[PDB]
Design a protein around this ligand. Sequence first.
Ligand SMILES: N[C@@H](CCCC[NH3+])C(=O)O
Ligand SMILES: [Ca+2]
Ligand SMILES: [Ca+2]
Ligand SMILES: [Ca+2]
Ligand SMILES: [Ca+2]
Ligand code: NA
Ligand SMILES: [Zn+2]
Ligand SMILES: [Zn+2]
Length: 316
Amino acid sequence: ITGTSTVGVGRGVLGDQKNINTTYSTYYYLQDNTRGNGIFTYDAKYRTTLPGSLWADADNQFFASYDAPAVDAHYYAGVTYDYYKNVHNRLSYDGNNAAIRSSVHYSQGYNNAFWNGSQMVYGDGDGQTFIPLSGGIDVVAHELTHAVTDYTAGLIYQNESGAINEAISDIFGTLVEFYANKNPDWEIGEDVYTPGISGDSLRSMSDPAKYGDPDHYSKRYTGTQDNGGVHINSGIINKAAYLISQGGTHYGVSVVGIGRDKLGKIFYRALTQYLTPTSNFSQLRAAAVQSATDLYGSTSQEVASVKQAFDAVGVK
Ligand SMILES: N[C@@H](CCCC[NH3+])C(=O)O
Ligand SMILES: [Ca+2]
Ligand SMILES: [Ca+2]
Ligand SMILES: [Ca+2]
Ligand SMILES: [Ca+2]
Ligand code: NA
Ligand SMILES: [Zn+2]
Ligand SMILES: [Zn+2]
């Protein structure tokens, strides 16, 4: 909408106070004009019709319980925008400053979040498995990274290409979490998962087997569940990415860690310059190797570490 840019204040899902960019025209809307062609946050009002209504507030104060998922969806979309712009020189998810749209309060008791081809969508959770899912910066950045992938590599959401798609979202979700530097880790969704249980999450990149996911190609899931295992077999790639960044010895194969910044550079270049819609794990290895070669040279430690990491998870 047309109005003047304002700065509201509110609390997120976890009770943390933060400022949010809003727009004033009779009401204060969750419309951030400071980034690209805008970040827009919507209320789905417990329905499944999307996007719902652009979030309107009478006084530019967002401290109600009902406000908190919208505060975080809006704020963390901004952090993610900043990450891609400042770290990768990418302007929004399409590289041309597309407006970023998110809806919160989707459905009732909805224990998930997703990118629907056009926008982000966040459930509130059922209060037991999840609290409102926009409270997790890695969740927000995971979903927005699906938009990046869909506008670049276009990895089909099935089988090995779908597991790469999922792993890319976990990788950059985690790198945004580290970028924001609030309780960063290599787990996915811990801030909004199971409020009665400390230390758990949906997935672990450092140890996928913690939650039953494979950490080696020999353990890949080959059934039909989960679109051929896209959230399961992502663990094989998540582990390789963790090893590239942090190093370690995995099934007797030692990897020299090269750090998160270089991990991000290698995988961003693979995603945007080498992967295609049908890329499989072996083709991802080749893409990461050639990406690291482009950036650092064929004899570099960076290339050697990419090779060791994919060796360690059984991907030739
Ligand atoms: N996002 C993953 C994990 C489940 C989220 C909670 N039910 C999936 O859709 O399978
Ligand atoms: Ca208010
Ligand atoms: Ca964390
Ligand atoms: Ca995390
Ligand atoms: Ca928990
Ligand atoms: Na699991
Ligand atoms: Zn995903
Ligand atoms: Zn998914």
